Amino acid sequence: FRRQLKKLDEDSLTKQPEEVFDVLEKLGEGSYGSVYKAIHKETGQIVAIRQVPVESDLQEIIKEISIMQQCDSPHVVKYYGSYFKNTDLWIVMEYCGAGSVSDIIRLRNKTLTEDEIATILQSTLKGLEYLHFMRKIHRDIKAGNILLNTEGHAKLADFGVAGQGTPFWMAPEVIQEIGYNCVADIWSLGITAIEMAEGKPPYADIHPMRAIFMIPTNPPPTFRKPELWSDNFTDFVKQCLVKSPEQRATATQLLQHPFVRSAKGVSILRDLINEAMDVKLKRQESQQRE
């Protein structure tokens, strides 16, 4: 029985197998890797275990891990450890119950309101302020890379890895490959702000091989129907979307912008987070045969 297991219980913490966590559900079978919810038995805390079965560039993953390890801030998804089980590598990291902002919009089939955007963007700007202060660049700012925990706090995840894809969020100086700095995230932030308000980035309906040429040499984008938005919102988007990087506003300056500075508390996101996670629960009841 467990009499055999109890004899085996005379083992140290080093001897402990990967039973340290209890896998519960497959939250999303993402292409980067199957991602499972789990609970650490000893701490009772909920973590997310990203299985990396793919023989991807494990340097591309280790580079993502090493960037994650270098960050200690509640605005950035934390990393807890890794282990090998079966044939694949499993990566334990911070759990965000609601998911990415893109899925929140998708699940509710609903665009985010202004006040919801200002709260979500204020938290992310505090994250960008922390990273830029450390002379780091996220490099992949977008709605699908901004996770919300069950409480309602936005968190940056899935750092872009410096190469050696889709351009709609890229700054002009970064696609032209003329060299870029921290304020590159400010451009993608501005595009993300549009993506939150109207569901798609500007040039989304444009082919990538086309958009690569238009974005560097065209006026900074704006709202498709700019009569639907407040002056502070349009001005904030205008100040994020400045083609000259040296002229582009920094994350610190944007935090004092009227649109962000007056952002309401996390409590406003309460209703939409309940909406999104209810569509997730029903989505899991239909895939199971029973």
């Binding site: 309906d205 086309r210 958009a211 040429f213």
Partner: protein
């Protein structure tokens, strides 16, 4: 991608009235309405498309309906030339061109022409690959876009198509750009007449001064 289709779209179409870039090849209508500033223009020669009874140009025989004024070396005309004749103008002025795809291009064996085109779909615009047949010797492009590739080379080096014009072409060209009855002279001859007509047109009617030629 990574083929001559990239070359076509790099230069693409830019509105002359407002400096707005579109990564769109030339084809189809070719009288282009700018979405940013509502300007009508020809995608080939960048001339204004004076549509109905508004043309300031003199001797407008075609003011009644949609028309535009195009130089002789605009794609608006050279699109009708054969692929072979265009290659002759290029060779006669010793300008190299592709007949095989560039080495980096790995054309999709099922796919055809990969030039990206905006096709009208319900409730918006959707970009799709051209996908027409890619003949051998056309450098991996379709017939329509391969000619356009050649015309860009001809426009790039400001080659004069009139160097290949026939007598009728010179008589057609003489009345269109010089507003005269081009009938021959008494005491003259058919060969000296061709060289005579060619000489004034080259000396008096310049090539398109607003065609995108990349400096």
């Amino acid at each position: 991608a990574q083929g001559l289709a990239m070359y076509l779209q790099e230069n693409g179409i830019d509105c002359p009235k407002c400096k707005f870039s579109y990564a769109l090849a030339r084809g189809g209508c070719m009288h282009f309405h700018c979405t940013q500033c509502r300007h009508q223009f020809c995608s080939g020669c960048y001339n204004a498309f004076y549509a109905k009874n508004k043309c300031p140009e003199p001797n407008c025989r075609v003011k009644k309906s949609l028309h535009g004024h195009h130089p002789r070396d605009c794609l608006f005309y050279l699109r009708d030339w054969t692929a072979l004749r265009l290659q002759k103008l290029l060779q006669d002025n010793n300008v190299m061109f592709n007949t095989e795809p560039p080495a980096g291009a790995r054309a999709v064996p099922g796919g055809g022409c990969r030039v990206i085109e905006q096709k009208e779909v319900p409730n918006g615009l959707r970009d799709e690959a051209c996908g027409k047949e890619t003949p051998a010797g056309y450098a991996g492009l379709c017939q329509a876009h391969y000619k356009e590739y050649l015309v860009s080379l001809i426009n790039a080096h400001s080659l004069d198509p009139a160097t290949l014009y026939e007598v009728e072409e010179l008589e057609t060209a003489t009345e269109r750009y010089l507003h005269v009855r081009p009938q021959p002279l008494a005491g003259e001859d058919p060969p000296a007449y061709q060289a005579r007509l060619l000489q004034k047109l080259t000396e008096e009617v310049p090539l398109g001064q607003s065609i995108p030629r990349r400096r």
